[PDB]
Write a protein that binds this ligand. Sequence first.
Ligand SMILES: [Cl-]
Ligand SMILES: [Cl-]
Ligand SMILES: [Mg+2]
Lengths: 228, 224
Amino acid sequence: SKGEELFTGVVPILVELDGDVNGHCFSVRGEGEGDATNGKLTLKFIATTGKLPVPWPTLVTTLVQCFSRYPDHMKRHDFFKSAMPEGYVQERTISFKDDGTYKTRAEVKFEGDTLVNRIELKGIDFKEDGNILGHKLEYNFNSHNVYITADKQKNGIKANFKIRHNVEDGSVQLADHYQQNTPIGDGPVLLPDNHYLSTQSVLSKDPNEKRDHMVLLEFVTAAGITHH
Amino acid sequence: GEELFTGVVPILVELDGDVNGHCFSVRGEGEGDATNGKLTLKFIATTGKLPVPWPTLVTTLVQCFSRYPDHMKRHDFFKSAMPEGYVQERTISFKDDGTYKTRAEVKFEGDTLVNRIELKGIDFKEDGNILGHKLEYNFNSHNVYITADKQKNGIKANFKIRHNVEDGSVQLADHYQQNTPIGDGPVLLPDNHYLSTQSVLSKDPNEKRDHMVLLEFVTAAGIT
Ligand SMILES: [Cl-]
Ligand SMILES: [Cl-]
Ligand SMILES: [Mg+2]
């Protein structure tokens, strides 16, 4: 209750990522704002360490599901907001088909008035001339469903989904996602029935930005529960 | 500048490192109380397990929080360069082993004191005390000897860090340091003096990541 009330208006967002893929270290900082009531957010990310060693699209899912629109009839299933402001730890394993793997750990929490997503990413076993290290992925994104289930023993949740990245030669690069979320605080949280998030992402560029960057507009809505 | 340190000041430390080709990152946060010469910080290895021992990074990871007693206020270069800050550069030579070369910018960003560092580790022995992780997780007390560098409108420092080795011996790390103001505002150039440093390393029992908890007491001395 005290959680969801933090999201009734427009909330400033800060994203920070430290990454290491096949021994290539990099950092990303992002800034923007989110409208959870409508399930919309806008962010601009900058590579603070030069040119990214991996394609921007491979980082989209890593780079705040508390901004998902949970319609009124599903309010009892919003784990993400209920964990606020103390927040939650989000851990993922991302397996790129016929290629390497990302392991990520993020803390999503309020720092003052700002919703912060602070991430550690490690990637291993990527192929030098594969789609990722070879930068062969198109600068766009498809819509996906994120399937969520309660992880009661861990007072948290799990999720599974498959990302489809368009490849410049017309092929498709699959990225299998496993996700788990655990509260940072020791207070009670909502543990949901099985459901999913429907996500759309629009990638663009800032014409006035000289640094390697990504502009992102996201739409997310929760579903998978029959209405009455 | 000194007016910025009369209370408790939030601290952010960010390190990008590369030792013998192994890149890593460290992020620390905490607070400083310069009136009492006290630092409290927790550092996280954000790229996973470090390739070097935590104690070898302590000196690299905000001497503006040193307690300068009232009779030495005119010798506090570090605070006088704030808020625009200073560049701190070091060469750290580990006895019979490799070398750290570091460049940091220390400055206020808003109300937070930020220490942002590039470290490069050169020519370390694969199974020496550093890359072979043979150093104890503790830290000794040292003197940091400071002199003015009038030509660089800044200061120089030198000192020798004593790292306890697992075999009961001591590994020396010779530090040479240069500090230069970032901005054009006037700064205080000190008479020769030193900092007395004391540190305690510990762990957070609830922290699963590779990390270091640090508590420090630093005072200025060497003048009657
Ligand atoms: Cl100690
Ligand atoms: Cl000494
Ligand atoms: Mg960094």
